[PDB]
């Protein structure tokens, strides 16, 4: 074919910057948060919308 449309949508997409946010916990304290979230304090999913 014709090799002239390469990069089309990647160059067409508008550029949006990442919002700065509070940093994430790491290690033994990140996996404590998941345990507290799912077991001690609680038919849908973690990322269910509306």
């Amino acid at each position: 074919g014709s090799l002239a449309r390469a990069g089309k949508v990647r160059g067409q997409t508008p550029k949006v910057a990442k919002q700065e946010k509070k940093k994430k916990k790491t290690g033994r304290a990140k996996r404590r948060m998941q345990y507290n979230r799912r077991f001690v304090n609680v038919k849908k999913g973690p990322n269910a919308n509306s």
Binding site: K43, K44, G45, S50
Partner: peptide
């Protein structure tokens, strides 16, 4: 008062979203 997984599965069991409606109905049942 959200969506009904039963109706979703019954209406979309043969469309592109069948694999997702089955998953949602299984989540509702179990």
């Amino acid at each position: 008062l959200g969506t009904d997984p039963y109706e979703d599965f019954q209406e979309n069991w043969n469309t592109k979203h069948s694999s997702g409606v089955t998953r949602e109905l299984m989540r509702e049942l179990n």
